[PDB]
């Protein structure tokens, strides 16, 4: 699927994209603070960021859809 | 020991020794290599090794008379055991080598107090027992039946890992 989803519960510290930006596989999408790590969540495929759903400082649960590429 | 290992007899060590006999005659007689061969044989042997300490186990006497560090399998001590690097009198003597004034009353008092403290706190079963260098401190009457139980446990001992080769070398 196109959904980039939060692999861990954590706190959104930074968003590395904007809505409608092109992204390539392995581009950074978000930084989640989980397990005391600034865990990078990255785009799995080339496309365009749509439905950007997360905000700086937001806590999000595992399986939250972050964006659709 | 080599004969007994060759014919698969278990070895029981019964210890009461100050260690190697000191002196120029023993050194010239070869005490270093002969002790080396005693050490070599005891470690080489594959048979079950059980030790009972009765009183003294000082220095190389402790080591060679089936210590756990030299691969003895089960180690017991009577409450009279005394396990140490050197006896109280040898420790006191080097103590008195410094500030040596051996004619004075005060240094004889210092020796007596040192020997008393040493035989209470150092030359005992209890440090070796608390470190697990020996497996148990036992009432002397337990010894016969405890030897039976131990050697029954050890009857099928397999000694390894050992690398098979032509032979072991020994001080010779």
């Amino acid at each position: 699927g196109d959904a980039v989803t939060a692999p861990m519960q954590g706190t959104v510290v930074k968003v590395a994209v904007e809505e409608g930006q092109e992204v390539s596989a392995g581009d950074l999408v978000v930084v989640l603070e989980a397990m005391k790590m600034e865990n990078p969540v990255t785009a799995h495929k080339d496309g365009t960021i749509t439905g950007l759903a997360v905000e700086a400082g937001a806590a999000i649960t595992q399986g939250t859809v972050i964006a659709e590429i | 020991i080599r004969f007994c290992d060759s014919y698969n007899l278990p070895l029981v060590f019964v210890v009461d020794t100050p260690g190697a006999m000191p002196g120029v005659a023993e050194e010239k007689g070869g005490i270093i290599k002969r002790g080396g061969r005693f050490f070599n044989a005891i470690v080489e042997a594959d048979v079950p090794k059980v030790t009972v300490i009765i009183r003294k186990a000082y220095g190389g006497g402790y080591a060679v008379m089936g210590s756990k560090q030299l691969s003895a399998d089960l180690n017991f001590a009577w409450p009279t055991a005394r396990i140490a690097v050197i006896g109280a009198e040898g420790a006191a003597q080097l103590l008195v080598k410094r500030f040596p004034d051996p004619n004075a009353p005060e240094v004889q008092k210092i020796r007596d107090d040192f020997i008393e403290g040493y035989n209470l706190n150092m030359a005992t079963p209890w440090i070796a027992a608390e470190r697990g260098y020996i497996d148990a401190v036992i009432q002397p009457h337990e010894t016969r039946l405890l030897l039976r139980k131990s050697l029954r446990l050890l009857r099928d001992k397999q000694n390894g890992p050992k690398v098979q080769r032509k032979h072991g070398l020994l001080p010779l």
Binding site: - | A20, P22, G23, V24, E26, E27, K28, G30, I31, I32, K33, G35, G36, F39, N40, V43, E44, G59, G60, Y62, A63, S67, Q69, L70, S71, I83, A84, V85, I86, G90, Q93, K97, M122, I127, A128, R131, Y133, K162, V163, R165, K166, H167, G168, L169, L170, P171, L172
Partner: protein, 344 residues
């Protein structure tokens, strides 16, 4: 606040520079006062330049604020003539080089290493006495180190360099090894020192009479006496050049195929034996001619001098030579000749 990665690496580098002289300035000064090199300087002169890799440089006694890095021994691995070896060297600047727990653990680890790889081990001994503050620990670790010769005896060559007073419990590990080389007037070996021999037995004896290098060589406890540590290192190199690394591998082949025809030196043997049956002669005149060259490398030459035990080469292959020496006691096989031959 954590330190940066650069700061952590700088800390490591300065801690390693500390651990190369862990006894500190006063012990460096006392060593220079006696004129001996450090344990590391010794290892670095033995091994091939730059080959030394130290193991456990940062080891310390657990639970001891007064512990010093390395616990009194240097251990590691390197090469001699490009061939792997393990090496340890006693460091008399830390706790007088006495056997602590971590001293024991490090030397045990090294002995297990050389058993696992199958390479020679060289011990540089100068003083590993009992540790005054924890002598029962020293007793236990003398025994623990001793036990691990089980992994090595007849599997890999063991060599002991006697560069100091090997006394007390310290004598029993070296005497297990295959080759003991002592420096004259510097190396000594004895269980009980002169002071205690006096106060127990009443006898008077000197260090040289009790355990001097040439006495222990005549008694056959020492295989070689040399005048300097550099000569000890060269004797070790020459010795190892006749030997495989372990019980399984092959020895090096040196100069095969020399002199394939009968030579004048071969023809000198036809008249080398004296005419009269009572006349003694030097057997080295024969040994220097029947092998590939003059490299008859003699071992324990002082022990039972009616007997020669030496390495030599035949068509480049090393051999052991057992020869009677008619020049000494008519070449009769005495007590020390017998045990020298049996060991060799």
């Amino acid at each position: 606040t954590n330190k940066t990665t650069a700061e952590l690496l700088a800390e490591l580098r300065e801690k390693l520079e500390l651990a190369k002289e862990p006894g500190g300035e006063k012990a460096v000064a006392k060593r220079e006062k006696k004129g001996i090199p450090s344990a590391r300087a010794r290892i670095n002169a033995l091994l091939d330049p730059g080959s030394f890799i130290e193991i456990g440089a940062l080891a310390k006694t657990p639970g001891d604020p007064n512990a010093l890095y390395g616990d009194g021994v240097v251990t590691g691995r390197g090469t001699i003539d490009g061939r792997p070896v393990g090496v340890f060297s006693h460091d008399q600047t830390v706790f007088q080089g006495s056997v602590g727990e971590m001293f024991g653990r490090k030397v045990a680890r090294l002995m297990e290493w050389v058993a696992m790889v199958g390479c020679p081990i060289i011990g540089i001994n100068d003083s590993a006495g009992a540790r005054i503050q924890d002598a029962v620990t020293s007793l236990a670790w003398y025994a623990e180190l001793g036990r691990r010769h089980e992994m090595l005896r007849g599997l890999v060559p063991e060599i002991s360099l006697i560069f100091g007073k090997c006394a007390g419990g310290a004598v029993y590990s070296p005497i297990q090894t295959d080759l003991l080389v002592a420096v004259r007037d510097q190396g000594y070996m004895f269980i009980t020192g002169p002071d205690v021999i006096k106060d127990v037995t009443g006898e008077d004896v000197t260090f040289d009479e009790l355990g001097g290098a040439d006495e222990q060589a005549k008694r056959g406890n020492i295989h070689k006496v040399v005048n300097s540590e550099a000569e000890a290192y060269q004797y070790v190199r020459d010795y190892l050049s006749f030997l495989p690394s372990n019980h399984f591998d092959n020895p090096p082949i040196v100069n095969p195929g020399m002199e394939p025809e009968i030579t004048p030196h071969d023809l000198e043997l036809d008249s080398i034996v004296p005419d009269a049956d009572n006349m003694a002669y030097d057997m080295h005149e024969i040994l220097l001619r029947i092998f590939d060259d003059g490299d008859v490398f003699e071992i324990a030459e002082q022990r039972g001098p009616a007997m020669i035990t030496a390495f030599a080469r035949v068509d480049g292959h090393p051999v052991g030579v057992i020869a009677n020496q008619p020049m000494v006691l008519s070449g009769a096989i005495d007590n020390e000749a017998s045990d020298k031959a049996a060991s060799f």
